Amino acid sequence: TTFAARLNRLFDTVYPPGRGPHTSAEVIAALKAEGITMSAPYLSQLRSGNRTNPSGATMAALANFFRIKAAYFTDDEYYEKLDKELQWLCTMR
Template identity: 45%
Template sequence: MTAERSAVPSTLAARIERLFRTAVRRPGGEPCTNEEVARACREATGRSFSAVYLWQLRTGRRDNPTKRHLESLAHYFQVPPAYFFEDEQGARLADELELIGALRDAGVREVVLRAVTLSPDGLGTISDMIEAIARREGRIRQ
C-alpha cells in the first residue's frame, strides 16, 4: 500500500499559490511578497511585471498570462514552465513541493534525518507504521 500522489492544483492561481507557500522563502522563513517576486521577475527579464498583476494571477482574477510571465515565474521559483500545466511533470513537481513544505516542519525534518541511517528493512518498517497511522487518521484512501 502506498500513499496516493498529492493532488496537483487544478488552477493556475492554486499552482502559483503553492509556489509561494513552498518553493522560495525569505531568509527568516517567511513567504515572499508579490512585490518581491514581481521586482525579481522585472529585473531578470527587463520587462514589465507588476505586483498587482501577480496578485491577480495568484487570486485567479487573471488566468491567461503571457508565455514570458510564466517563464519569468518559473525562473524565479526554480521550476520548469511545465509546472503550470497539467501533466506528469507537473504532478512530480507538485509532489516535490509538498515534500519541501513538509521538511520545513521541525518534527518532520527530525524524523527524516533519523531515518537516513536506517537499513532498507528499517525504512520499510517505518513506512508501514506511517501508513497504518495515516490510514487510522483517514489521510490515505484505500
Template identity: 40%
Template sequence: MPESSESAGLAQRLDELFRRGRPGGERWTNDEVAAAIKRLNPDIKVSGTYLSALRTGKRTRPSPELQLALAKFFGVSPAYFFDPGSADKISQQLAALDELHQSGVRSLAARAVGLSPDNLDALKTVVDQMRKMQGLPPVVE
C-alpha cells in the first residue's frame, strides 16, 4: 500500500527533529526520546522501536497524545506534524537556530545575559564596528 503524502510528511518531519539533535549537536536516539516521553507522560505507551517505525514511515498514525508529547519534547508546535505551512515555518526557524549555534552566536548571547543596558549598548557598538571592519552590512533592528 503506497504511503500517503501526509504520512510521508509526518515521517520526514519527525526524522528532521531527531536529526537536528540536542543543543551541542549530539543526536537523540529513539530509545532516549521514548524513555523521556514515558517519564513525562506515564500514560503514553511508546518505545524506541515504535518511534523508529514512525520516522521511516512504516507506522503512520501516532495518537494525538503522542504527537503532543513529541511536540512538547522537541519544543515545536503540534501543528508541525500535520500542517505543511506551520511545518515549513518551524523548519526555517530551526534552521536559523542551527546557524546561530554553528556560528558561535549563541555562545556570545549567553555571555551577554545579565549585563546592564549600558553594557549591552556598548557591546552592540563593538559588534557593529567589527561588522563594519569586515565589510558586513549593518544590522537593522
C-alpha cells in the first residue's frame, strides 16, 4: 500500500465523531499550531500520489496529528493490524 493510500485511509478513519473527517486545511492549521510548516499544495501532492517518498519529519508530523506511530506508513504488518484497530475505534467513537 502506497503512502497516499495510507494517508487517505487515516483521513477516512481518524476524525472527531459527530464532526467528520478533517479537511487538508485543518491538518495544515493544526501542524502550524505546533510550529510545523506544510504547504497546502504539498499535502495535496502527498494525498494524490503526485509526490511520494515524504521525509521522516513529514511522516512524523502527520503521524503525530493522527496520533499514530509513523511505522503505520512504513511497516506492512503494523499498518494492517493498526488500520483494523483504528476502524474499530472509529465505530466505537
